[PDB]
Structure 1
Amino acid sequence: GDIKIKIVSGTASSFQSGSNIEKSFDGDYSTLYHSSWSNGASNYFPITLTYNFETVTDVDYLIYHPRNNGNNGRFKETEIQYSADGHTFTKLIDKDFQGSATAGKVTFDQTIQAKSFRFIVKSGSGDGQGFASCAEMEFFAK
């Protein structure tokens, strides 16, 4: 009986219209958040994604679900951060999601009290210099 925390809102520093961040918290593994398809800029990365809860909440682990079809945007090198108030962020861990096509679970060394989590995606798979995309992002408490 692990509680899946309710994500109420989010932001993305890059998105393609119709694939904004909320498509990664709609409960549907086929619908994607996807960064802008125009990925030629030198400062395109990093791509920063923020997921917000309604209130500060206990969280023990998260699962990033990448797209299973297509290779554009599977996360690679990320910095994961959390915020107790939604404004000030603290580094939690550098996580290499490896460009993997399968879900990546990150389990914390303690229960984290957070109103928000943030992913600074430094690299991601795909055409050109790559993209960032996410089928679902999930947060859980034991």
Structure 2
Amino acid sequence: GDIKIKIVSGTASSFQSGSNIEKSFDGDYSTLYHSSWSNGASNYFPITLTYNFETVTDVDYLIYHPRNNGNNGRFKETEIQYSADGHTFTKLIDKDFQGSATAGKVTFDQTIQAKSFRFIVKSGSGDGQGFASCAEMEFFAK
């Protein structure tokens, strides 16, 4: 069957203390990555999230898992990027997660060779202008 790719590290351009990026790859669907609660700035969005593998890897699809209760931070419009070496990034696709309360699967047209994936989150649901949050982010090869 399908094989889950191991995320070894990541970064977030915005995070609330204790809700940094690595909380969205701890295998726990209740723990959250969550952007900073100070979401008033005009340049608060976009919020840029990066997930790293140990080495360049074949990847066929991903699944974004939003928080399964509460509405703050469910992804809306995003740009998905990836990098073969972890340094230079390439646009994959624009993906609108629609502020959905359930998981969003993105299936790539062809297998990608990526050491890193990157999400430019343009918008997300929630109070005020919104937030960005994620219970778990997953990557798979077929």
For the residues of structure 1 that align with 2:76 and 2:96, how far apart are their CA atoms? Answer: 5
| SS, match of residue 22 in structure 1 | helix
How far does residue 72 in structure 1 lie from its aligned partner after superposition?
0.2
How far does residue 68 in structure 1 lie from its aligned partner after superposition?
1.1
How far does residue 9 in structure 1 lie from its aligned partner after superposition?
0.1
How far does residue 103 in structure 1 lie from its aligned partner after superposition?
0.2
- 2:97 is the alignment partner of 1:90: no
Alpha-carbon RMSD across the aligned residues, in angstroms, is 0.3
1:11 aligns to what? 11
5+ residue gaps in structure 1? none
How far does residue 56 in structure 1 lie from its aligned partner after superposition?
0.1
> Deviation digits for residues 43-73 of structure 1, max 9, x if unmatched?
0000000000000000000000001100000
How far does residue 91 in structure 1 lie from its aligned partner after superposition?
0.3
For the residues of structure 1 that align with 2:2 and 2:15, how far apart are their CA atoms? Answer: 31
For the residues of structure 1 that align with 2:70 and 2:64, how far apart are their CA atoms? Answer: 16
Matches within 5 A, 1:1-142: 1-142=1-142
Find runs of 4+ consecutive structure 1 residues off by over 2 angstroms: none
How far does residue 79 in structure 1 lie from its aligned partner after superposition?
0.1
> Deviation digits for residues 87-114 of structure 1, max 9, x if unmatched?
1000000000000000000000101000
Instruction: Quote the sequence identity (%).
Output: 100
| SS, match of residue 102 in structure 1 | coil
How far does residue 29 in structure 1 lie from its aligned partner after superposition?
0.3
> Deviation digits for residues 11-33 of structure 1, max 9, x if unmatched?
00000000000000000000000
| SS, match of residue 29 in structure 1 | coil
5+ residue gaps in structure 2? none
TM-score (norm 2): 1.00
> Deviation digits for residues 69-92 of structure 1, max 9, x if unmatched?
000000000000010000100000
How many residue pairs get aligned? The number is 142
